[PDB]
Ligand binder design. Structure first.
Ligand code: CLA
Ligand code: CLA
Ligand code: CLA
Ligand code: CLA
Ligand code: CLA
Ligand code: CLA
Ligand code: CLA
Ligand SMILES: CCCCCCCCCCCCCCCC(=O)OC[C@H](COP(=O)(O)OC[C@@H](O)CO)OC(=O)CCCCCCCCCCCCCCC
Ligand SMILES: CC1=C(/C=C/C(C)=C/C=C/C(C)=C/C=C/C=C(C)/C=C/C=C(C)/C=C/C2=C(C)CCCC2(C)C)C(C)(C)CCC1
Ligand SMILES: CC1=C(/C=C/C(C)=C/C=C/C(C)=C\C=C/C=C(C)/C=C/C=C(C)/C=C/C2=C(C)CCCC2(C)C)C(C)(C)CCC1
Ligand SMILES: CC1=C(/C=C/C(C)=C\C=C\C(C)=C\C=C/C=C(C)/C=C\C=C(C)\C=C\C2=C(C)CCCC2(C)C)C(C)(C)CCC1
Ligand code: SF4
Ligand code: SF4
Lengths: 135, 29, 74, 43, 62, 80, 139
C-alpha cells in the first residue's frame, strides 16, 4: 500500500546491482534482496502488511523466541535441579555438564512444558515466600 | 477468583486496539 | 558495521509503519494507507450526519503542503 | 591426577569460554549461507 | 520452635524477611527477649547468616 | 555532636566499642543478653561520625546507629 | 595534673597548630619498661623513654590511634587528658579507670532506645515538632 516498491522495479536498487563487486557478499545476497520492499533510495525496508508478510515477519519471531526460551528454560531447570540436591552453592561455579545437558533436552519441548506448570501453578512463586523490603 | 473487573477493561482496551488495527490493515472503512 | 564494511544495503531498516499510519489517519496522503481522513469516502472525512468539518479543508492544505513542519515525513 | 583435570574444565570460565567457540557456529552459518541474510530472506 | 526446625521470618526490617531458616538454639533463661537463634543459607550483606529473633515474629513451615 | 542511639537488638559482643576510634561507646550491664551487657554512648560529643561501629555490629539490621547531625569542630576532625 | 618526659622525637610537621593553643589540646601519658621505637600519629617514628612518657596530640583520634599502638607493645596503662588553654586538665580516657570494652557497674544506659530499630516512627509523626524521629518517646 505504501511507497515501499519491491526491489525488482525500484529504480534506485538496480544501480546497486549494476556497479558492484562479486565475491560472496554483493552477488547472491543481493539478488536475494530483490523480493524485499525498498524505498526511494534502494535500501530494503521491513514493513508490516497483513498477509503478504504475515509469515515473512513471523519466522524471526518463532525461530528466535523458541531458542530464547530454550536458553532460559534449560537455565531455569538446571538451577532447580541443583537446589533439590542441596549443593547449589558449589554446582553453580563447577557446572555439572551431565545434568545441564539433561536439563537442555528437557527444554527442547518447553512450550508444552511451561503450560504444564502454569495450570499446575508451579511456574511462579507465591508472594508470601519471596523476600521483600519494608513496604 | 474469576477476574471480572480487571478483564472487560483490559479487553476493552484490547478492543480499542483492534478497531485501530482494523483501520490499519484497511479492513473497515 | 554494514555501512563501514561496504554493504549499506544490508542495514536493518524498520519502516515505522505505526506512526506513518497516524499521519495517514490525519490527512497525509504521501504514504497511501488511504484510511480515515486520507480516504475522502469515509465516515470521519465527511462526517455524514452533519458535515460540519469546516476546519478540515484548511487543515488538509496544511498537512499536505511540504513546506511546513506539520507532520513531517517519517 | 587426571581425574581432577576435567573437574576443572567443568568450572565457570571454561564452559563459558567454550560457550563462545560453540557460538562459532554463527561463523559457519554465515560462511556458506551467502552471508547476507536479512529479515525477509530466510525461511 | 525447637532446634533444627525450619521457620519463616516476620521481621520487616530484616534482610531475611519471609526467608526459610533453620533454628540453631533457643535460650531457656526467659529474660533475654530474643531467645531463638535461626541460621539462614544466604548471607545478608558482606557478613552474617545467623541472627537472634523473638518468638512472636517467627512462623514455622515444618 | 552526632547522635548514637542503641537499640535492644544488642547481643553484647563488644565489637562496636573495640572499633570506635574516639571512645564514644562503652559497655554497661544489662539483663537481655547472655553477656549481660549493652553498649551506651556517653561521649557522643566525641562522635567523629565515621560509622565504624556500624560495620562491626553483627545483628541483622544492626542495633546501633549514627545519625549524622550538627557537625562541630571535634565532630569533623580538624587539627587546625 | 600531668607530667613525664617527652619521647625522643626530632620534630615533625603534622604536630600541633594554632588550634592547640587556642581551643583544646590532648595529652597521652604512658610508662614503658623499654627503650623502644614507635610510630607517631603525626607521621614519622619516635623513641619512647623508660619512665613516664608524655606526648601532646591535637585531637582525640590521634591519641587512641596511638593508644591502640601501645596495646600492641603490651603497654595498657595510658591516660589521655584534654587541656583547655586556661590550663584546665580534665581526664577523659579511660574515664572510670577501666577500659570501655569490659563492663563495669554504676555506668548508665545513656542514649538507648527500648524498641527495635525498624519500629522507629515515621517523619510525618514528628512534623513541625522539636524532636527527631529517632528520639521518639513512645517505645
Ligand atoms: C519495550 C518495547 C518497545 C517500546 C517502549 C516501543 C516504543 C515505541 N515504538 Mg515500537 N516496536 C517494538 C517494541 C517497542 N516499541 C517491537 C518489538 C517492534 C517490532 C520490531 C516494534 C515496532 C514499531 C514500529 C513499526 C513503530 C514503533 C513505534 C514506537 C513508538 C510509538 C509507540 C508505538 O506505536 O509502537 C509500539 C508497538 C508495540 C508492539 C508495543 C510493544 C509491546 C511489547 C513490548 C511487545 C513485546 C515484544 C514482542 C513479543 C516481540 C514508541 C516510542 C513507532 C515509531 O517508531 O514512531 C516514530 C512505529 O511506527 N514500534
Ligand atoms: C520528546 C520526545 C518525543 C516523543 C515522546 C515523541 C512521540 C511521538 N512522536 Mg515525535 N518527534 C520528536 C520527539 C518526540 N516524539 C522530535 C524531536 C521530532 C523531529 C522534528 C519528532 C517528529 C515526529 C513526527 C513527524 C511524528 C512524530 C510522531 C510521534 C508519535 C508517534 C507515536 C505513535 O505512533 O502513536 C501510536 C500508534 C497507534 C496506532 C496507537 C495505538 C492504539 C492504542 C494502543 C489504543 C509519538 C507520540 C508521529 C506523530 O506525530 O503522531 C502523533 C509523527 O508524525 N514525531
Ligand atoms: C499520538 C497519537 C495521536 C495524536 C497526537 C493525534 C492528533 C490529532 N488527531 Mg488523530 N488518530 C490517531 C492518533 C493521534 N492523533 C490514531 C491512532 C487514529 C486512528 C483511530 C487517529 C485518527 C484521527 C482522525 C479521524 C482525526 C484525527 C484528528 C487529530 C487532530 C485533532 C485532535 C483533536 O482536537 O480532537 C479531539 C476532540 C475530541 C472531542 C476527542 C475525540 C475522541 C475520539 C472520538 C475518540 C490531532 C492533530 C482529527 C483531525 O485530523 O482534525 C483535523 C481527525 O478527524 N485523528
Ligand atoms: C483519536 C482519533 C480521533 C480524533 C482526535 C477525532 C476527533 C474529532 N472527530 Mg472523529 N472519528 C474517529 C477518530 C477521531 N476523531 C474514527 C476512528 C471515526 C470512525 C468511526 C471517527 C468518525 C467521526 C465522525 C462521523 C465525526 C467525527 C467528528 C470529530 C470532531 C468533533 C469531536 C466532537 O464533537 O466531540 C473531532 C475533531 C465529528 C465532526 O466532524 O464534527 C463536526 C463528526 O461528526 N469523527
Ligand atoms: C467516534 C467518532 C464520532 C464523533 C466524535 C461523533 C460526534 C458527533 N456525532 Mg456521530 N457517529 C459516529 C461517530 C462519531 N460521531 C459513527 C461511527 C456513526 C454511525 C453509527 C455516527 C452517527 C451519528 C448520527 C446519526 C448523528 C451523529 C451526531 C453527532 C454529533 C452530536 C450532536 C451534535 O451535532 O453536536 C457529534 C458532533 C448527530 C449529528 O450529526 O447532529 C445533527 C447525529 O444526528 N452521529
Ligand atoms: C490541534 C492539533 C492538536 C491537538 C488537539 C493535539 C493534542 C495532543 N497532543 Mg499533539 N501534535 C500536533 C497537534 C495536536 N496535538 C502536531 C501538528 C504535532 C507534530 C506532528 C503533534 C505532536 C505531538 C507529540 C509528539 C505528542 C503529542 C501529544 C498530544 C496530547 C497531549 C496532552 C496530554 O499530555 O495530556 C495531559 C497530561 C497531564 C496534564 C499529566 C497529568 C496526568 C496525571 C498525572 C494522571 C495520569 C497518570 C498516568 C495515567 C500514569 C500512567 C503511567 C504509565 C503507566 C503510562 C494531546 C491530546 C503527546 C501525547 O501524549 O501523545 C498521545 C505527545 O507526546 N502531539
Ligand atoms: C586467563 C585469565 C583469565 C581471564 C581473562 C578470566 C575471565 C573471566 N573469568 Mg576467570 N579464572 C582464571 C583466569 C581468567 N579468568 C583462573 C586462572 C581461575 C582459577 C581456575 C579463574 C576462575 C574463575 C571463576 C570461578 C569464575 C571466573 C569468571 C570469569 C569471568 C568474569 C566476568 C563474568 O562473566 O562474570 C571472566 C570473563 C566467572 C564466570 O562466571 O565465568 C564466565 C567465574 O565464575 N574465573
Ligand atoms: C502507552 C503506555 C503503556 C504503559 C504500559 C503500562 C504499564 C502498566 C501495566 C500494568 C498496570 C497494572 C495496573 C492496573 C491493574 C490493577 O490496578 O488492578 C486492580 C484494580 C482493582 O481491582 P479491585 O480492587 O476491584 O479487586 C479486583 C476485582 O475487581 C477482580 O475483578 O482493577 C482495576 O481497577 C482495573 C485496572 C484497569 C486500569 C486501566 C483502565 C483505564 C480506563 C481507560 C479508559
Ligand atoms: C541467529 C540469529 C537469530 C537468533 C539469535 C539469537 C538466538 C539470539 C541471541 C542471543 C543472546 C542470548 C544474546 C545475549 C546477551 C546478552 C548480553 C550481552 C547481556 C547483558 C547484560 C548486561 C550488561 C546487564 C548488566 C546489568 C546488570 C547485571 C544489573 C545491573 C544493571 C546492568 C544493566 C548494569 C535470529 C533467529 C533472530 C535471526 C538473526 C540471527
Ligand atoms: C504479534 C505482533 C506484534 C505485537 C506483539 C505485542 C503487542 C505483544 C505483546 C505481549 C504481551 C503483553 C506480553 C507479555 C507477557 C505477560 C507475562 C505475564 C509474561 C511473562 C513471562 C514469563 C512468565 C516468562 C516465562 C519464561 C518463559 C516463557 C520461558 C523461559 C523462562 C521464563 C520463566 C523466563 C509485533 C508488533 C511485535 C509484530 C507484529 C504482530
Ligand atoms: C587461560 C584461562 C582461560 C582461557 C582464556 C583463553 C584461552 C581465551 C581466549 C580467547 C577466545 C575465546 C578467542 C577467540 C577466537 C577465535 C575465533 C573466533 C576463531 C576461529 C575460527 C574459525 C571458525 C575460523 C574459520 C575460518 C577459517 C578457518 C578460514 C576461512 C574463513 C573462516 C573465517 C570461516 C579461561 C578464562 C577460560 C579460564 C582459565 C584460565
Ligand atoms: S551494637 Fe554491636 S557490639 Fe554493641 S552490643 Fe550490639 S551487637 Fe554487640
Ligand atoms: S561514628 Fe565513629 S566514633 Fe562514633 S560511635 Fe561510630 S565508630 Fe565510634
Amino acid at each position: 500500500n505504501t511507497t515501499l516498491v519491491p526491489c525488482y522495479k525500484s529504480p534506485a536498487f538496480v544501480e546497486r546491482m549494476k556497479n558492484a563487486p562479486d565475491s560472496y557478499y554483493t552477488t547472491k545476497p543481493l539478488k536475494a534482496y530483490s523480493q524485499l520492499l525498498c524505498g526511494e533510495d534502494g535500501l530494503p525496508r521491513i514493513a508490516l502488511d497483513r498477509l503478504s508478510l504475515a509469515v515473512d515477519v513471523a519466522i524471526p519471531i518463532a525461530i528466535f523466541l523458541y531458542t530464547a526460551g530454550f536458553i532460559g528454560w534449560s537455565g531455569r531447570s538446571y538451577l532447580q535441579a541443583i537446589k533439590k540436591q542441596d549443593k547449589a552453592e558449589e554446582k553453580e561455579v563447577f557446572i555439572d555438564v551431565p545434568l545441564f545437558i539433561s536439563c537442555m533436552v528437557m527444554a527442547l519441548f518447553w512450550p508444552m512444558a511451561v503450560i504444564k506448570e502454569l495450570l499446575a501453578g508451579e511456574l511462579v512463586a507465591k508472594d508470601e515466600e519471596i523476600p521483600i523490603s519494608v513496604r | 477468583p474469576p477476574y471480572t473487573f480487571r478483564t472487560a477493561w483490559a479487553l476493552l482496551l484490547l478492543a480499542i486496539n483492534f478497531i485501530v488495527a482494523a483501520y490499519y490493515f484497511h479492513i473497515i472503512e | 558495521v554494514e555501512v563501514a564494511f561496504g554493504a549499506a544495503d544490508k542495514q536493518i531498516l524498520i519502516e515505522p509503519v505505526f506512526a506513518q499510519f497516524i499521519q495517514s489517519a490525519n490527512g497525509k496522503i504521501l504514504y497511501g494507507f488511504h484510511t480515515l481522513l486520507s480516504n475522502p469516502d469515509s465516515i470521519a472525512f465527511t462526517a455524514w450526519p452533519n458535515h460540519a468539518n469546516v476546519w478540515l479543508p484548511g487543515w488538509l492544505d496544511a498537512i499536505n503542503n511540504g513546506t511546513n513542519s506539520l507532520f513531517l515525513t517519517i | 591426577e587426571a581425574r581432577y583435570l576435567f573437574r576443572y574444565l567443568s568450572s565457570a570460565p571454561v564452559v563459558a569460554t567454550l560457550a563462545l567457540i560453540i557460538i562459532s557456529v554463527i561463523l559457519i552459518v554465515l560462511n556458506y549461507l551467502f552471508p547476507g541474510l536479512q529479515y525477509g530472506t530466510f525461511f | 520452635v525447637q532446634r533444627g526446625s525450619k521457620v519463616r521470618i516476620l521481621r520487616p526490617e530484616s534482610y531475611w524477611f519471609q526467608d526459610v531458616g533453620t533454628v540453631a538454639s533457643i535460650e531457656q533463661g526467659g529474660t533475654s527477649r530474643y531467645p531463638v537463634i535461626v541460621r539462614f543459607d544466604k548471607v545478608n550483606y558482606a557478613g552474617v547468616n545467623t541472627n537472634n529473633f523473638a518468638q512472636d515474629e517467627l512462623v514455622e513451615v515444618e | 555532636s552526632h547522635t548514637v542511639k542503641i537499640y535492644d537488638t544488642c547481643i553484647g559482643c563488644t565489637q562496636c566499642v573495640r572499633a570506635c576510634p574516639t571512645d564514644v561507646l562503652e559497655m554497661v550491664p544489662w539483663d537481655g543478653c547472655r553477656a549481660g551487657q549493652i553498649a551506651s554512648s556517653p561521649r557522643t560529643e566525641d562522635c567523629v561520625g565515621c560509622k565504624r561501629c556500624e560495620t562491626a555490629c553483627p545483628t541483622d539490621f544492626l542495633s546501633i546507629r549514627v545519625y549524622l547531625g550538627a557537625e562541630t569542630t571535634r565532630s569533623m576532625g580538624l587539627a587546625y | 595534673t600531668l607530667s613525664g618526659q617527652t619521647p625522643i622525637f626530632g620534630g615533625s610537621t603534622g604536630g600541633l597548630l594554632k588550634k592547640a593553643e587556642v581551643e583544646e589540646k590532648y595529652a597521652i601519658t604512658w610508662t614503658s619498661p623499654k627503650e623502644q621505637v614507635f610510630e607517631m600519629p603525626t607521621g614519622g617514628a619516635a623513641i619512647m623513654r623508660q619512665g613516664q612518657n608524655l606526648l601532646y596530640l591535637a585531637r582525640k583520634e590521634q591519641c587512641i590511634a596511638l593508644g591502640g599502638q601501645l596495646r600492641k607493645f603490651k603497654i595498657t596503662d595510658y591516660k589521655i587528658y584534654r587541656i583547655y588553654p586556661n590550663g584546665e586538665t580534665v581526664y577523659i580516657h579511660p574515664a572510670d579507670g577501666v577500659f570501655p570494652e569490659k563492663v563495669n557497674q554504676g555506668r548508665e544506659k545513656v542514649r538507648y532506645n527500648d524498641r527495635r530499630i525498624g519500629q522507629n516512627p515515621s517523619p510525618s509523626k514528628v512534623k513541625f515538632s522539636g524532636i527527631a524521629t529517632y528520639d521518639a518517646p513512645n517505645s
